[PDB]
Structure formats: C-alpha cells, structure tokens
A paper describes a structure:
In the first of the major states, the BTF ring is intact, ARM2 is extended, the JD ring is intact, and the pore is closed. In both the resting and preactivated states, no density peaks consistent with a bound Ca2+ ion were observed at either the JD or CD binding sites. The IP3-binding site is best resolved in the resting state where Arg568 on ARM1 coordinates the 1-phosphate of IP3 conferring a specific orientation to IP3 in this pocket as predicted by mutagenesis. For example, the abundance of the putative resting state, which closely resembles the ligand-free state and shows no evidence of bound Ca2+ ions, is negatively correlated with the concentration of Ca2+. At low Ca2+, 45.2% of the particles adopt the resting state whereas this percentage drops to 0.7% at high Ca2+. In the resting state, a portion of the wedge loop, including Thr926-Ala943, inserts into a cavity surrounded by the CLD, ARM1, ARM2 and ARM3 and adopts an ordered conformation. By aligning the maps based on the strength of the density for the wedge loop, we found that the flexibility of ARM2, as assessed by the local quality of the density, is inversely correlated with the strength of the wedge loop density, indicating that the presence of the wedge loop stabilizes ARM2 in the extended conformation. IP3 generated in response to extracellular stimuli can bind to the ligand-free channel without altering its global conformation, yielding the low-energy resting state. At low Ca2+ IP3Rs must escape a low-energy ARM2 extended resting state in order to activate by binding Ca2+ at the high-affinity JD site.
Author numbering:
A (entry chain B): 2111 to 2226, 2260 to 2403, 2449 to 2623
B (entry chain A): 2333 to 2403, 2449 to 2526
Write the structure that this text describes.
C-alpha cells in the first residue's frame, strides 16, 4: 500500500571492493525471483557452509549460487501447482505419521507375535480394531497406511527439495533418496513377505533424532581406530592361543549341555583353541582363566597358569578393551570442541567479512546492523541473481565489474576484514584532519 | 511418615541432594543429556528386539533357563517373541558376556556352533562394549562441558 514501504522491502544494498582496493556501496532493486527462496534452505546453507583454508565461507557461498537460483526457480514453478505444493508443505506431518505407524506396528508384533493430543485417540482406535477385527487385520491396515504415507512423503520430499533439479544422476547419488527407497522396500517386505521386516524400520529413529545421530557419530568417526584395536586384540588372542596349545592343551576343558560325556576338549586344534579364547576370554571379566580347568598349588604348572591368566587379564581386558572406550571418549571430546568452535564462530563473526563482534563496540553501527543491513549474504545472493538476470546492455559500472569478476572466477570483490561502517568513518575523519 | 507408615521417612533422604551442591552438580552431569541417554537406551532396545527376532527365528531351542520353583527345573524362554525379548533385554544386558552367558552351551560338533559363536560375539561387541559405554561416554562429556562452562 505504502510506496515507501514497498520500495524499502524491494530494495537492497551491499558493499564491494574495486580493483583499486576501494570500498563502494551499491544499492539495487531485489529481483522478483528472489522472493521464492525457502527459509529451510537458507538456514541449512547458513548452518552448513564451511570455511576454506583461508577461513572464508565466500567460496562455498558463491559456488552454491547457481543451485540457489535453480531452487528458487523450481519453487516458483511449483507454487503454481496447489495440490503438489500442499502435499510438499506437510513433510513433517508425513514423517511423524510414518514413524508412529512403524512404532505401533513393531510394538504390536513384539507383544502379540506369534498370533493365530491425538496419540491417545489413535492408541484407543488401534486397541478397538485389534479387539474387533483382529491382530492380522490391524497389522494389514497399519502396513497399508504406512506404505501410502511413505509414498506421499517421498513425493513431498522430491517436490520440495528439487533433487531432480541437479539431474537424475544427482538424485541417485543422494543418500537420503536411497534411504527413503530402502524404507519403502522394507515396508513392502513387511506388508507382503513377512511382518518381521517391520523391525528394520525402527532404525528411522536415528534419522529422526539428531542427538542420537551425534552419539553414533562419536563411534563412527574413529571406526578405523576401533577396527584396528579389534585386530590387535585378535592378534594377541592368536598368540595366547598358540601358547596355550603348545603348553596348556589339557587345561581347555569346557562343559557342554548336549541336546537329547558332559565335558569336551576345546584346544585339540589351533583353530578351536583360538575360537574358544576369542569368545570366552573376551566375554568373561576375568579373562581366559575363568573357563580353564582350576589348577592345584601342588601342580608344577601352577605358577605358569597364574602368569598366563594374569598376563591375559592385564594385557587384553584392562588395556586393549578399554582402548575402544577411550577412543569413543576422545571422539566425544573432539566433537564437542568442534561444535562449540563452529557455533562461536558463526555467532560472533560476520559471514561475509569475518569480522568479530568486538571491533563494533562503541560505534554508531553495531554488529546486528552490520549483519542485517550492510553485509547480508542474502543481499549478495540477490545481487548475483540480478547480475545473471539483467541484460548486459544496461549494466552500470559496478554491475559490469562484478560480471567481469564472475567471468574470471575472482572473489576479490567480496569484502574481507573490512567494513564501510567500521573504519571508513574514522578514516574520513583523520583524512579531514590531514587536509 | 508420622501417621500412615514410618517407612515414608526414607524419602526424606533425598534432601541430601538439595543440601549439597556438589552432589547436585554430579546429578546434573547425568540429567543435562538425559535425552541422549534415553535415546541410547531406545537404540539398545531396538538392537535387543532385532537380536530376539533372530534368535526366535533360528535359535529357539537354545533359550533354556533354570528356575527355582517355589514349594522340571528348566523352562523355555523363547517360545514367544515377547518372552524372548524380555529374556534377552534382561539377561544379556545384566551379564558381562552378553546373551551368550545364559544360552545353552553348544558343542563343536553341532552344525549351528559357528552361528552361535557369531551371534554371541556380535551381541557382545555391538551392545555391551559400544551401546552401553555410550551412556558413560555421554556422562563424561557432560562432566567436561560443565567444568568448562
Ligand atoms: C517390552 C518388550 C517389547 C516392546 C519393545 C519392542 C519393540 C518395539 C520397539 C519400538 C521402539 C520405539 C522407539 C521410539 C519411541 O519410543 O517412539 C515412541 C512413539 C512416538 O514418537 P514421537 O514422534 O512422539 O517421538 C518423539 C521422541 N522419541 C522418538 C524419542 C520418542 O510412539 C509412542 O509414543 C508409542 C509408545 C507406546 C508405548 C509402548 C511401550 C513399549 C514399547 C516401546 C516404547 C519405547 C520403549 C519404552 C520402554 C520399554 C521398557 C521395556
Ligand atoms: C531381524 C531381521 C528381519 C528378519 C525377518 O523379517 O525374517 C523373516 C523370515 C522369517 O521366516 P523364516 O523363513 O525363518 O520361516 C518362515 C516363517 N516362520 C518364521 C513363521 C516360520 O526370515 C527368513 O526369511 C529367514 C532367512 C533369512 C533371514 C534374514 C532376512 C533378511 C535380513 C534383513 C535385514 C538384515 C539386517 C539386520 C539389521 C542390521 C542392519 C545393519
Ligand atoms: C528405517 C530404516 C530403513 C532402511 C534403511 C536401510 C536401507 C538402505 C539404505 C541405503 C542408504 C543408507 C544411508 C543413508 C544415509 C542418509 C543420511 O545422509 O542421513 C543419515 C541419517 C541422519 O539424518 P541427518 O541428521 O543427516 O538428518 C536429520 C534431519 N531431520 C531430523 C529433520 C529428519 O541417518 C540415517 O539415515 C541412519 C539410518 C540407519 C540405517 C541402518 C540400517 C537399516
Ligand atoms: C556403530 C554401532 C551400531 C549401532 C546401531 C545403529 C546402526 C546404524 C548406524 C548409522 C550410522 C550413520 O547413519 O552414519 C553416521 C556417520 C555419518 O558421519 P557424518 O556426520 O560425517 O556424515 C555426513 C553426512 N550426513 C550427516 C548427511 C550423513 O557415518 C559415517 O560417516 C560412516 C558410516 C560407516 C558405516 C557404519 C556405521 C556404524 C554401524 C555399522 C553397522 C551397520 C549399520 C547399517 C548402516 C550403515 C551405513 C550408515
Ligand atoms: C602382575 C604382572 C603380571 C604377571 C606376573 C605374575 C607373577 C605370578 C607369580 C606366581 C608365583 C606362584 O604362584 O608361586 C607360588 C608357589 C606356591 O607355593 P606352595 O607352598 O603352594 O608350593 C611349595 C613350593 N615352595 C616351597 C617353593 C613354595 O610357590 C612358588 O613360587 C613355586 C616356585 C615358582 C618358580 C617359578 C616362578 C615363575 C613366576 C614368574 C616369573 C615370570 C614373570 C613374568 C612377568 C611379566
Ligand atoms: C613394559 C612391558 C609391558 C607389559 C604389559 C603391557 C604394557 C604395560 C604398561 C605400559 C608400559 C610401557 O609402555 O612402559 C613405558 C615406560 C616409559 O617410561 P619412562 O620413564 O622411560 O618414560 C619414557 C616416555 N616415553 C615412553 C614417551 C618415551 O617404560 C619403562 O621405562 C618401564 C620399564 C618397566 C620394565 C618392567 C615391565 C614389567 C611389566 C609389567 C606389566 C604390568 C601391567 C599392568 C596393567 C596391564 C595389565 C592388565
Ligand atoms: C520405599 C518407598 C516408601 C514405601 C512405604 O513407605 O511403604 C509403606 C507401605 C507399607 O505397608 P504395606 O501396605 O506394604 O503393608 C502394611 C503394613 N506392613 C508393611 C507392616 C505389613 O507401603 C504400602 O502402602 C504398599 C503399597 C504402596 C507402596 C508405595 C508407596 C508410595 C510410594 C512413595 C514413594 C515412591 C517414590 C520412591 C522414591 C523415588 C522417587 C523418584
Ligand atoms: C527430601 C525429599 C522431599 C520430597 C520431594 C518430592 C516431592 C515433590 C516435589 C516437587 C518439586 C520437585 C523439584 C524441586 C526442585 C527444587 C530446585 O529447584 O532445587 C533443586 C535442588 C537443588 O538445590 P539448589 O542447589 O538449587 O539449592 C541449594 C541451596 N542450599 C545448598 C543453600 C540449600 O534439588 C532438589 O530439590 C532435589 C530433590 C530430589 C527429589 C527426589 C524425589 C523425592
Ligand atoms: C538420574 C539418576 C538418579 C539418581 C537419584 C536421585 C534422583 C533425584 C534427581 C534430582 C534431579 C534434580 O534435582 O534436577 C537436576 C536438574 C537441574 O538442572 P539445572 O541445574 O539446569 O536446573 C536449574 C534450576 N535449579 C538449579 C534451581 C533446579 O534437573 C533438570 O534440569 C532436569 C530434571 C529432570 C527430572 C529427572 C532427573 C533424573 C532423575 C530421575 C528419577 C526420578 C527423580 C525424582 C525427581 C525428579 C525431578 C527432579
Ligand atoms: C570379532 C567380530 C565379530 C564376529 C565374527 C565372529 C566369527 C566367528 C567364527 C567362528 C568359527 C568357528 O567357530 O568355527 C570353528 C569350527 C570348529 O571346527 P572343529 O574341528 O571343531 O569341527 C570340524 C570341522 N572342520 C574340519 C571344518 C573344522 O570349524 C569351522 O570353522 C567350521 C566351518 C564354519 C563355516 C561357517 C563360518 C561362519 C562364520 C563367520 C562368517 C560371518 C562373519 C560375520 C562378521 C560380522
Ligand atoms: C563396520 C560394521 C560395524 C560393525 C559393528 C558396529 C560398529 C563397529 C565400529 C565402528 C565402525 C565404523 O563406523 O567404521 C567407520 C569406518 C570409517 O573409516 P574411514 O577410513 O573411511 O574414515 C572415514 C571417516 N568418517 C566416518 C568420519 C567419514 O568405516 C570403514 O572404512 C571401516 C570398514 C570396515 C569393514 C568391515 C567391518 C567388520 C566389522 C567389525 C566389527 C568389530 C567391532 C569390534 C568392537 C565392537 C563390538 C563389541
Ligand atoms: N553476514 C551475516 N553474518 C551473520 N549473520 C547473518 C549475515 N547475513 C544474515 N545473517 C543472519 O541470517 C538470517 C538471515 O536474515 P534475513 O535478513 O534473511 O532475515 P528475515 O527476518 O527472514 O528477513 P526480513 O525480515 O528482512 O524479511 C538472520 O539471522 C540474519 O541475522
Ligand atoms: Zn561484515
């Protein structure tokens, strides 16, 4: 309604650096296409963009400009389609419905197999269906609902994300799409082949919960270290088994509960000795000595047995096994430190210029205004889109300069540790004093 | 405690936490990431459910448990999926060696001996050394974060 309000909303400003290392302020109109940028995509980019070797996110932010433009174009195209857009807007609802259905199906299977808010209402309806129709019909209905809801969720996911915008190859390469396809296949298997396949769907908890994902990362980050420690444990077990087979063959007597003698020799062969050690010594707190024949102090090999058991216990149980847990704790610490560093950087430094919030103290302009009005990464994206959408025939000085810098793949036009609102005022003031 | 039953006085011992700040910080070291601990427990439950399904499908006869009947001494603890899940979730988690510490001892001549060995080893590595230790790792991480803050 208000022309001034409309122009203020559709007008943006940025700061650039020219070839002579001089800072200039450019005021431009926001292209209409820029209005179709999703807040989810903006947040994802802001929280995922990484720093380069020089500590700048500008390289990645610029490299994502084409993807952002294509995503905005796809969103504009989709918004003309009401039904598909409406379905795409409810991805969270579809995912929640699918997860609840999977949980209910798994609970029913656990509590009844073998056989033959609105959540309380859903539970009551499920109980009534079980009482009236039966477990089988209830499971069939739940499986059909889960399959339909997952199909709707996949349609919504593709529509909203525009993964096809990068091509079918990119969509296939995407891990999330493959995960959704595998989930659909698992649901189909549960519905038709055997209901027990529904148990696999419980792994969707990891996908849904980020905290559990971080906990799992604490183990998977140093998975190579864990596997190497396990291999070292296996080598030590092999050596101990060799020693036992050479000198303690008769002490490997194991009780057995034969199905319709009660003891057997478990070290007649090297492979059997290795298997017995690797299993029992590792699964017993006291080590291999907890299953070997109990010796007597009068035996000549009693000191040897004591030394063997003690060495196994100290070397394998207290050290080797605890190394995996130590690696897990170290990974926990490293993840926490990295996350804290990243959050501190993101919250106390400027995305474009990288200046800290401590140069802006005691000045007309604060960090908040500097990030909302002067170095807006989104305003830079809008300027990039304008340069790419504007006919070359009506470029201005700075528009042509930025277009040429883009043609040459040069980022030196983004400011870096410099702000027109920070040092330009004092610089002009000292210049006036000098003059 | 004064009127209904004197045993209610035991609840008053929780005032120690209120009185002592150090114990309160120790409890905070666990309660700060309570959601993480609960999610880890749910993951453990899901893994136990999968292992119980596998055992019921292929190792039904090996779930024999001794019982001290009040005035046969063994019973089958995996005749149903729910019973198998309960037995695993209890014994495997409360035994250092895992679920294998309560299953029937096999013989090397049995055709399923390698399968039993693999099952027990997988349960031990996946659930006992990793999943259970994740809660303790979370507690240690919370300790470190609290001290740093
Ligand atoms: C006993 C042994 C047999 C049963 C266990 C065997 C198999 C079933 C495994 C199902 C695992 C479910 C894990 C996720 C879950 O728990 O999601 C509950 C969902 C609601 O999801 P939401 O979107 O609100 O998730 C919000 C946050 N999130 C995801 C952390 C809850 O459904 C609900 O609430 C419905 C819950 C109804 C009550 C069922 C109680 C027992 C089974 C499962 C619940 C979890 C374990 C409880 C403790 C069991 C101790 C033995
Ligand atoms: C637990 C995983 C799901 C297992 C599952 O639904 O079993 C389904 C069938 C069970 O019927 P049955 O043939 O035994 O007897 C026929 C019919 N009855 C059992 C009533 C006698 O099993 C079979 O087909 C038995 C032979 C194949 C079993 C493996 C099925 C494929 C595995 C899928 C998931 C594997 C990954 C596990 C999670 C970790 C991921 C990293
Ligand atoms: C339900 C199970 C369905 C069947 C899955 C197996 C079939 C084969 C699939 C091939 C692809 C497997 C790898 C997929 C990696 C996907 C990825 O890159 O995401 C990893 C995600 C974590 O999700 P996030 O934290 O990145 O997003 C969370 C955002 N929120 C919270 C808004 C939802 O974890 C995950 O998929 C963890 C999945 C663990 C699967 C275990 C084996 C089954
Ligand atoms: C471990 C103990 C097992 C616990 C039960 C849960 C099993 C499922 C584990 C899912 C792991 C997963 O979702 O991945 C976690 C990390 C992701 O790391 P990031 O945040 O840097 O990924 C950046 C990209 N973003 C975030 C989009 C993915 O994975 C990686 O990096 C490397 C993943 C290597 C694959 C093995 C992970 C450990 C589990 C093995 C047993 C089989 C599980 C079946 C699924 C295997 C494929 C996942
Ligand atoms: C912790 C670090 C890890 C491992 C080191 C463990 C060392 C264990 C030593 C066991 C010694 C033992 O249990 O022996 C006690 C026996 C019992 O005497 P009795 O009165 O029942 O028998 C009458 C015989 N009468 C009169 C001579 C006593 O008497 C004896 O010492 C009998 C004579 C034993 C002579 C051979 C000793 C070999 C032991 C250790 C050397 C290797 C150390 C390797 C470190 C790496
Ligand atoms: C040692 C033999 C190993 C036995 C079992 C495996 C490992 C035992 C614990 C680690 C020992 C170790 O790597 O030692 C290293 C020390 C170094 O010390 P440094 O002052 O030169 O500093 C130099 C600093 N740097 C190393 C950075 C240059 O070497 C020394 O001098 C220590 C010399 C000790 C010689 C007698 C060894 C008797 C073995 C006892 C085993 C007890 C194990 C108990 C716990 C585990 C079993 C469950
Ligand atoms: C331990 C908690 C206090 C329990 C307590 O004082 O029991 C009192 C009564 C005991 O008499 P009785 O009826 O068994 O036999 C009648 C008389 N006689 C026992 C001599 C045969 O118990 C009863 O009323 C028995 C039935 C109710 C028991 C639960 C009492 C209410 C629970 C309160 C605290 C719960 C939280 C525990 C701390 C964790 C907080 C997070
Ligand atoms: C004696 C028990 C009496 C019955 C209690 C249960 C009845 C239900 C109560 C509803 C409220 C429960 C939550 C209260 C939170 C209070 C709060 O906000 O304080 C948390 C305090 C820690 O006290 P602080 O370090 O903040 O102050 C210390 C300052 N100084 C050292 C000078 C004294 O811990 C606490 O109450 C921990 C209390 C733990 C109760 C367990 C369940 C019983
Ligand atoms: C855990 C293992 C159990 C150990 C036995 C002791 C049970 C009593 C635990 C008392 C916990 C408590 O006093 O709270 C600790 C934290 C407080 O955190 P903050 O310093 O940021 O609080 C800022 C405000 N300020 C300081 C004034 C409260 O609580 C929170 O934040 C979240 C508290 C969530 C409630 C569950 C806590 C864990 C225990 C569960 C079993 C049932 C205990 C009954 C009492 C439940 C209510 C407390
Ligand atoms: C640590 C990582 C976690 C798990 C991996 C554990 C692998 C356990 C391997 C057990 C192997 C075992 O205990 O076997 C030893 C038996 C005993 O031989 P005997 O002289 O008493 O019997 C006479 C028969 N004669 C002449 C052929 C020897 O002989 C044999 O190997 C008999 C032939 C066995 C063939 C099937 C082997 C399946 C095992 C593993 C593959 C899956 C690995 C999954 C990893 C994830
Ligand atoms: C793996 C299957 C899982 C088995 C049991 C559960 C988890 C075992 C330990 C964690 C394994 C894990 O997440 O691995 C991850 C490694 C990654 O290493 P990367 O060099 O690519 O670094 C890439 C760095 N990132 C991940 C940040 C992108 O994946 C790899 O490449 C490792 C490829 C290894 C393939 C053979 C797997 C045989 C399984 C052995 C289980 C032994 C467990 C012993 C202890 C637990 C049982 C009590
Ligand atoms: N250069 C930057 N440095 C730090 N944070 C930034 C930067 N540019 C943007 N942000 C933050 O990223 C988010 C994007 O701000 P944006 O102007 O898009 O907000 P908005 O409220 O959605 O917009 P508007 O109200 O102007 O229509 C905000 O949190 C903003 O503070
Ligand atoms: Zn800036």
């Amino acid at each position: 309604e208000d022309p001034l309000a409309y122009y203020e909303n559709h007008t943006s400003q940025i700061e650039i650096v020219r070839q002579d290392r001089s800072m200039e302020q450019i005021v431009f109109p926001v292209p209409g296409i820029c209005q179709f940028l999703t807040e989810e995509t903006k947040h994802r980019l802001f929280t995922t963009t990484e720093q380069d070797e020089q500590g700048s996110k500008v390289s990645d932010f610029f490299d994502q400009s084409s993807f952002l433009h294509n995503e905005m174009e796809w969103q504009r195209k989709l918004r003309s389609m009401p039904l598909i857009y409406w379905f795409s807007r409810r991805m969270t609802l579809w995912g929640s419905i699918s997860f609840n259905l999977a949980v209910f199906i798994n609970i029913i299977i656990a509590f009844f197999y073998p056989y033959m808010s609105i959540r309380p209402l859903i539970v009551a309806l499920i109980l009534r269906s079980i009482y009236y129709l039966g477990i089988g019909p209830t499971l069939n209905i739940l499986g059909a609902l889960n399959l339909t809801n997952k199909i709707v969720f996949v349609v919504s996911f593709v529509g909203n994300r525009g993964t096809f915008i990068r091509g079918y190859k990119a969509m296939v390469m995407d891990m999330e799409f493959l995960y959704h396809v595998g989930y659909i296949l698992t649901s189909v298997l549960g519905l038709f082949a055997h209901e027990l396949f529904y148990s696999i769907l419980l792994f969707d908890l990891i996908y849904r919960e980020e905290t559990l994902f971080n906990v799992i990362k604490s183990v998977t980050r140093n998975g190579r270290s864990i596997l190497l420690t396990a291999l070292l444990a296996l080598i030590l077990v092999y050596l101990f088994s060799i020693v036992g087979f050479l000198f303690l063959k008769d002490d490997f007597i194991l009780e057995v509960d034969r199905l319709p003698d009660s003891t057997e020799r478990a070290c007649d062969t090297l492979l059997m000795c290795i298997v017995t050690v690797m299993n029992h010594g590792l699964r017993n707190g006291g080590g291999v000595g907890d299953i070997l024949r109990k010796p007597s102090k009068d035996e000549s090999l009693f000191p040897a047995r004591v030394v063997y058991d003690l060495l196994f216990f100290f070397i394998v149980i207290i050290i080797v096994l605890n190394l995996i847990f130590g690696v897990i704790i170290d990974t926990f610490a490293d993840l926490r430190s990295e996350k804290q560093k990243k959050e501190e950087i993101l919250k106390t430094t400027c995305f474009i210029c990288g200046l800290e919030r401590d140069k802006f103290d005691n000045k007309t302009v604060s960090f908040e205004e500097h990030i909302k009005l002067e170095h807006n990464m989104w305003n830079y994206l809008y300027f990039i889109v304008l340069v790419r959408v504007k006919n070359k025939t009506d470029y201005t000085g700075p528009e042509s300069y930025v277009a040429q810098m883009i043609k040459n793949k040069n980022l030196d036009w983004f400011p870096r540790m410099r702000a027109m609102s920070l040092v330009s005022n004092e610089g002009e003031g000292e210049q006036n004093e000098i003059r």
